Write a protein that binds this ligand. Structure first.
Ligand code: 03C
Length: 245
């Protein structure tokens, strides 16, 4: 069994549908808001297995699993403000410019945890983060081609490492400060690939100060070994936060 992670499906009260495996909102024992993912069977449950070993306040938290019933459920904490990408596009009336860097910090704390566990995300993007009722950003979908979030060594030789997560984080910062624009907005993936290899980088978004841009820019160093760690980036972000607020 999955031990204490096994949830009784009869403690769930399904309330609203959120998308379509199948994602719904509900309550667990009339008390806690949850998101519920419905469903191959063996590879679906892998997401949950990864999530049983990773726990952080900026990482979407597994609550449990229902595996003794078809279909199988995955249950997690509920993120009321949904996807970070849509939030950045549709919910600007709800956050200040200073808060953009706080969103960055939330993601950076999650990524520093993952990095310390020697665990790669491989798909870090605004689309793969979620936002709770307080505007706290959390990394999601880490239990499960993104050309626009990839460094050249990934594009050219499928060289995945901590430094490929670092590159994508920089692109995520760019997404945040550009209020959810698609990176390389006038290029196809193929053109993006070509231009990246030639050393073209994303421009400084208007809302980003020079200090902030330096932080995202450092994530895009051509040499993977020259890119910082999440530990370094977290310290860079706190520093700028102290200065710019
Ligand atoms: C069930 C699950 C298992 C493992 C990892 C993550 C989740 N998960 N899925 C949705 C949510 C949410 O909290 C959530 C709450 C409200 C809204 C939304 C949106 C996000 C984007 N999706 S989508 C993928 O259809 O575009 C629509 C619904 C998501 C959440 N925590």
């Amino acid at each position: 069994g999955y031990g204490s992670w096994e949830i009784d499906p009869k403690d769930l009260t399904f309330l609203k549908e959120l998308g379509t495996g199948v994602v719904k909102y509900g309550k667990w024992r009339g008390q806690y808001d949850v998101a519920i993912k419905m469903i191959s069977e063996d590879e679906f449950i892998e997401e949950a297995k990864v999530m049983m070993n990773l726990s952080h306040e900026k990482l979407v938290q597994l609550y449990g699993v229902c595996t003794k019933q078809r279909p199988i459920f995955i249950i997690t904490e509920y993120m009321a403000n949904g996807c970070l990408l849509n939030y950045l596009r549709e919910m600007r009336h709800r956050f200040q410019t200073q808060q953009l860097l706080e969103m960055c910090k939330d993601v950076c704390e999650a990524m520093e945890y993952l990095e310390s566990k020697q665990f790669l995300h491989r798909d870090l993007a605004a689309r793969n983060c979620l936002v709770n009722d307080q505007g706290v950003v959390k990394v999601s979908d880490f239990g499960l081609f993104p050309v626009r979030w990839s460094p050249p060594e990934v594009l050219m030789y499928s060289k995945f490492s901590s430094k490929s997560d670092i590159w994508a984080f920089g692109v995520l910062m760019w997404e945040i400060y550009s209020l959810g624009k698609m990176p390389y907005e006038r290029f196809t993936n193929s053109e993006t690939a070509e231009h990246i290899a030639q050393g073209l980088r994303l421009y400084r978004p208007h809302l980003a100060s020079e200090k902030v841009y330096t932080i995202m820019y450092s994530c895009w160093h051509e040499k993977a070994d020259e890119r910082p760690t999440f530990k370094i980036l977290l310290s860079n972000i706190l520093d700028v936060m102290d200065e710019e607020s």
